[PDB]
Ligand binder design. Sequence first.
Ligand SMILES: [Mg+2]
Ligand code: NA
Length: 1217
Amino acid sequence: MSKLEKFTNCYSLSKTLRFKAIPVGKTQENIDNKRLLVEDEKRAEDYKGVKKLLDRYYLSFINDVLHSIKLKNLNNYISLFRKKTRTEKENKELENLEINLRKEIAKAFKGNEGYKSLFKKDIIETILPEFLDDKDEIALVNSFNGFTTAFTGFFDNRENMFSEEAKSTSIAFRCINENLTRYISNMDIFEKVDAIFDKHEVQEIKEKILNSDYDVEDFFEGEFFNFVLTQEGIDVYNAIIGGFVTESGEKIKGLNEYINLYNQKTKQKLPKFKPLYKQVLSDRESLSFYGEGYTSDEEVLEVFRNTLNKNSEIFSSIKKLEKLFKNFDEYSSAGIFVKNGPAISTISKDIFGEWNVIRDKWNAEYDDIHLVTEKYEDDRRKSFKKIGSFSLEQLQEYADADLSVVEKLKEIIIQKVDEIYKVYGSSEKLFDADFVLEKSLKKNDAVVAIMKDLLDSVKSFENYIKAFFGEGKETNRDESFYGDFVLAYDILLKVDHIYDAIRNYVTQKPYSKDKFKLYFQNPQFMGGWDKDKETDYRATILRYGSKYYLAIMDKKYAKCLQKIDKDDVNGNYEKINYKLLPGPNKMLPKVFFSKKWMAYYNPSEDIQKIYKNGTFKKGDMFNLNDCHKLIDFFKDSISRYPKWSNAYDFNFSETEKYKDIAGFYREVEEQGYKVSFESASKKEVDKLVEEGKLYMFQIYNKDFSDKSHGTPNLHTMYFKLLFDENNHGQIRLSGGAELFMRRASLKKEELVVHPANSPIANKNPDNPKKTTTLSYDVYKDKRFSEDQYELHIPIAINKCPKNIFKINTEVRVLLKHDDNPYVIGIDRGERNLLYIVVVDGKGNIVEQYSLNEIINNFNGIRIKTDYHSLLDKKEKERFEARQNWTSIENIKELKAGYISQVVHKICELVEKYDAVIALEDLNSGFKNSRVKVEKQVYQKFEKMLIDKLNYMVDKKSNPCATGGALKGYQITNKFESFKSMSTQNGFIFYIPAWLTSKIDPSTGFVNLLKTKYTSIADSKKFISSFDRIMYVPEEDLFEFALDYKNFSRTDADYIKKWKLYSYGNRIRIFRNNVFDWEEVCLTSAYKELFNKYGINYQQGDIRALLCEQSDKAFYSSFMALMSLMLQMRNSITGRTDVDFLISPVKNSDGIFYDSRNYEAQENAILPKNADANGAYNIARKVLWAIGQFKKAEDEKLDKVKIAISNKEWLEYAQTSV
RNA sequence: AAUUUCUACUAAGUGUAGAUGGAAAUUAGGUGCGCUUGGC
DNA sequence: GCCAAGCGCACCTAATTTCCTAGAGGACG
DNA sequence: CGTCCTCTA
Ligand SMILES: [Mg+2]
Ligand code: NA
């Protein structure tokens, strides 16, 4: 047997199957005539309106409770939370207080007399109408009288808000786990950074943010946290931290802005405050003012013309500022000024090419007077900060004879105005009144471009003009220039609101209608499938050969299908007969202790007292003999209950064997499910569809086409297995199915069409049939061009698991006794999205390859898809759409499509090699920092892999085989959340990443040297700590013999004594100032360096000779070369041809490991590149953990640490060879 | 260039291969642009 | 040119909760 | 009392 074989039927999970519902016969005509779809579409709109009106009540209920609550456990909790030496029993007391703090909040809600009525019909029928004051709102609510069952789920979503448990949707969790934690962390930050703020800044926040009713420091003491339970107080507190924007546009500074300013001034790095999260269900209104935007295309065009045409206001000032700057030479150069900040940087780049030239030229003139060098540049930075403004006459001093600044300014303002004119010539037709759009502005890229190119050039002109304001408050100021300048600039500034508002409109996703749910006038439509509820739900399933049907009875003919006989003679549909006894532990007492039943039988006071007391449950009041008789009472009653005794041919165990009541309940639950089919006359049923008393839909996907011939979708297999005699409860059909209408979203005639009898190009370059010619047209996106019904069907897998064990423990036992267990190591990155290495139980590489491309073979045809290229494309189309105001397209479907190929290949590897999976213990935190590279796939890869391994099916297998659809493998624990995962998830192990890639696989050598240059004396010490440094004539290499015991914090190394060589090349990454690269030849570079300084490098050991240098540049250049030598991973940014791994150390045969010597080979014994090396050593770090399982008794496997330490790893990697 | 839906296809002619947990609710994040005040 | 703190708008992405029910019971003509 | 919607565990 294998290890996989042990992991079937371990736990339950639910899934949904989705199908198209094709109306059959006169079904559609009858639905058209009764106007059912228009009623359902209006209902969904009204339903969202009532949901919004309920939230208005719910929120008022919440705030009245939260505004009045004083947390009792609070000060004890904060005190203990801030303790830094906590005993393990103090940590336990902290959890107890956290829990009790959430119980205070939950009981405050749930202790209200009205709480229960908030989630029954009372809230719609009575409570909400009395709360409301608007005749039309009240009438919207009243329209759901008799339909409140439709809110049962929404009432569960609202009930979740009032839980006491540490659950993400709970109010208490938001208050105590999240916001109280940030409030307390912020208190500590306040006590550190307190003194940075001066009286004026703290008084400003008090006045403009705190309504002069509080001091800023109040919100950093524990007793004020109650103020911050409601959104109103969260806004105030977050304004303290972040400030707000006034009606005038002024940005008032919060504490975090002041902290930043101080940090940027003192070059320090003080910590910043965290803002609190929003209160659940609050309707947020910002404390900052933001002007009113636009609401219609017509309005965007009227504003664009009124404000930007030729004879418009904003234009005429561009015309003014132009002629103004074209006459600079009537105003004193001494009185016009460029304020010392971004203005002087801007002007520097536009006059001297680079932002820093003006400061540089000023620094040189400072040096000329004032000539300790870190003192200096600090004073000289200060002395230069004290200058507020530079006049144009002063800036002329910096020009070089060929250059005059004023004339250079002129051509700049000419350059930009010519750019403005140019764009108007492309905006001729837009400014005409006779023009009106052929397309809407959220879907008319050509018109948006003409506007955006216009708006851009005006902003470009405006930012250049803004540099000429100066500080303003300078005396010498030429008010014959500023007078007209200030007037034409303050009008141009009006473009800021227009630019902002036009982008805010024009980049809006256009409206797309959602599908909507169908009820067929029944508030509990299709609620379940039980035969005894057909009349209440009015939906059933029929089968005619291989085709399946949904059958719906009209509200006025609920019985119309039960009475149908069989047509012994002609044809018959098969009508489903489904029986379910759900949740026997609750159902059985509710039915047999009911008035409708306690009339029939009478439970003895013996039977009555025991359920009244609670002596049935395992707990603090147990008694096995009571549940024994209780079980026999239930068993006795099941016989007398007709609609159960005949539905499930029960086969209970001998009563004396149950240990608690849940032992009886599990047999009732498992046996309380039966699905069969009864016959029904096809002619009689079809007539019902004709007459309109029955609606019929084929449950359809393409696997049910008459033309289908390939392997079905896995979901088709699940669906058909629902009704297969070999399915003995492994997959159950559940209630809760739903039916929707998705209106067409594309016009048929607007679709891309490959017309019949014209050859279509095949796109797969490995496909030798280059063309396909069909006798019928084929349309792009055909399915969205017709209205479609869709049916969603929930199923339950392994509802009654028999293999209950701790899955993690079982894997460890199995690995312990496996004499040769395989490992799939998976390195996750961005140069290679995913890299796979499979090892055997001795660490021999069995398979290795990147998954940037997916290789598939079918029908002899090979196909290769470069998903790394596709995602890179999509990522760049999205980056451009954002900057151009064009459509931002989805990437997550492409990711999902890519990841599904990956997951499929990993499942084949798992099955082929019976292998566990090794991954890097990537903390949540590294993963969010790489989310900016939208190609990123780390977490989506994890979610889909874990999901598939919750129920893993080779869909080619026999369905009754282990690993077929009825006996799926369950080798990860049931996905509840990431939050709750450990470093083992069944067959998946997460191990420490440290030096899995930057390590020589052939020796175990790693770079543990600190080679950043710091000073001459440190460089001399570093050099002298080598045992020898010499040139080796016979190899043309420099040798650097070292004992790691002579260097700082090298303890993890095992071998200690290494000989490094200047062997081969490296790629030096650096910025000139963005990331560039150059190849370096090490030996040749060392010779260049030593020659530059007259160093006779042939002179045997040269450690002492190198320490005779006095130039800092020598030691600095020498340390850089050492870093390059110790840099084993080398790559070009965005390049497939360079990502090699090269070792500066020889192995036992005198060979340097060079991954490129393995890149060539098709079957390689060592990794083929650095990413393969990463995956290899990730797998080996799990081999190590397996080695720990084997050193341990079985009873203790659960407590074996799987995280190899850094010291253990180097030892392991340096003794494996 | 067809789909319950998605990705890649045309796969032998209305389709092929793999994947696919829906619904509702809550909440958070990332990118991009503008504005405020600042730092190389 | 790059970057920080903060406010705003637009977009897409995604984490974590809950249900996946038949039969008693009530309202009502 | 028959039917339809609500509620419960
Ligand atoms: Mg198929
Ligand atoms: Na942002």
